């Protein structure tokens, strides 16, 4: 009588409270800095904002009743304390008897976890409020939030294959756009790296947040290129060159990505690199082939950012901005290559 989604949730949070269990509480008291009130505060704050925004009718998302909000918050909290408790019990610092004051006082983890959870309720009630409404409403930087998604699938296995598929698809929304927003912290972190973009040998074959974002970004791109290379039936010897043009743009043109899509730069590298060898496929042969992937809409290649404002079309981008920023490297191939992961 419930849906297979809302049904799993209520089995997930059976006879759990929306409060820490006596085993999460004891890991908290095992800390010099017991983190219970700062965690209890965040949860109050995220909630009061959740409810202030849920219940306000913007002319873009109509506003619903308070009665359901507190229902969608109580649940996201029960899951928080359950996934907090899993996460902390499995932490190899807990397992080697070490003092977890420093893990338990990273608020961006606490805030994105509660966020990730809130998305789970709303996805699983089929909510109007499509991602990324939740991170917007809560002022969360998608660059810092995406890192909780790989923690929550492995710290809650009672999650349907349609919950996970959801969590990986919003993780992919953050690696393809969203985190390359002008206001993202990816730019602050590339700055304190003297603007040094990590390459596919230093991340697939250095550590941190920049390396792990470009590790997941090089992974998503490589996957999307394999499945275009197959559908458009070109060499494994040229694909290994379209990847080195798609690395040149990320690495020696990383502004190109600002307020844009991963796919705009990947598709543009295909056409340019099929043409400077004698193995031509065309932007339509490519539009249609690409048109088939789960992340592929028309806006990506029919509404491309050109000026920062003039927007337009993927071909106008190749002619106005791309040809001029890449032709130098691309025409060296008529010159070392980069390694395709997997």
């Amino acid at each position: 009588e419930f849906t297979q989604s809302v049904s799993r949730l209520q089995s997930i949070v059976a006879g759990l409270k929306n409060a820490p269990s006596d085993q999460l509480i004891n890991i908290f008291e095992s800390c010099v800095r017991n983190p219970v009130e700062n965690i209890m505060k965040i949860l109050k704050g995220i909630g009061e904002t959740f409810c202030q925004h849920y219940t306000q009718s913007t002319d873009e998302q109509p506003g619903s009743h308070i009665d359901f909000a507190v229902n969608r918050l109580k649940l996201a909290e029960i899951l928080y304390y359950k996934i907090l408790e899993t996460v902390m019990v499995q932490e190899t610092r807990r397992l080697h008897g070490m003092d977890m004051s420093v893990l338990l006082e990273q608020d961006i983890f606490h805030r994105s976890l509660m966020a990730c959870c809130l998305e789970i309720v709303l996805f699983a009630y089929s909510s109007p409020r499509t991602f990324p409404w939740i991170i917007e409403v809560l002022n969360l930087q998608p660059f810092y939030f995406y890192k909780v998604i790989e923690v929550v699938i492995r710290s809650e296995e009672g999650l349907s294959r349609d919950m996970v598929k959801h969590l990986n698809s919003i993780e992919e929304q953050i690696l393809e756009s969203l985190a390359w927003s002008h206001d993202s912290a990816l730019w602050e972190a590339l700055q304190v790296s003297a603007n040094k973009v990590p390459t596919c040998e230093e991340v697939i074959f250095r550590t941190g947040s920049l390396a792990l974002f470009y590790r997941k970004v090089y992974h998503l791109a490589s996957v999307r290129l394999r499945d275009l290379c197959l559908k458009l039936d070109v060499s494994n010897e040229l694909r290994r060159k379209i990847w080195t043009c798609f690395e040149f743009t990320l690495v020696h043109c990383p502004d190109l990505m600002k307020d844009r899509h991963l796919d705009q730069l990947l598709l543009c590298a295909f056409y340019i690199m099929a043409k400077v060898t004698k193995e031509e496929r065309t932007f339509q042969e490519i539009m249609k082939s690409y048109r088939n992937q789960p992340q592929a809409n028309s806006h990506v290649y029919r509404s491309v950012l050109l000026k920062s404002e003039e927007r337009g079309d993927l071909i106008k981008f190749y002619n106005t901005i791309y040809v001029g920023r890449v032709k130098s490297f691309a025409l060296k191939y008529d010159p070392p290559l980069s390694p395709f992961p997997h």
Binding site: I272, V276, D313, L331
Partner: peptide
């Protein structure tokens, strides 16, 4: 000239 003289339509 590595330019696309194509004209996206539909």
């Amino acid at each position: 000239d590595i330019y696309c003289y194509e004209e996206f339509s539909d």
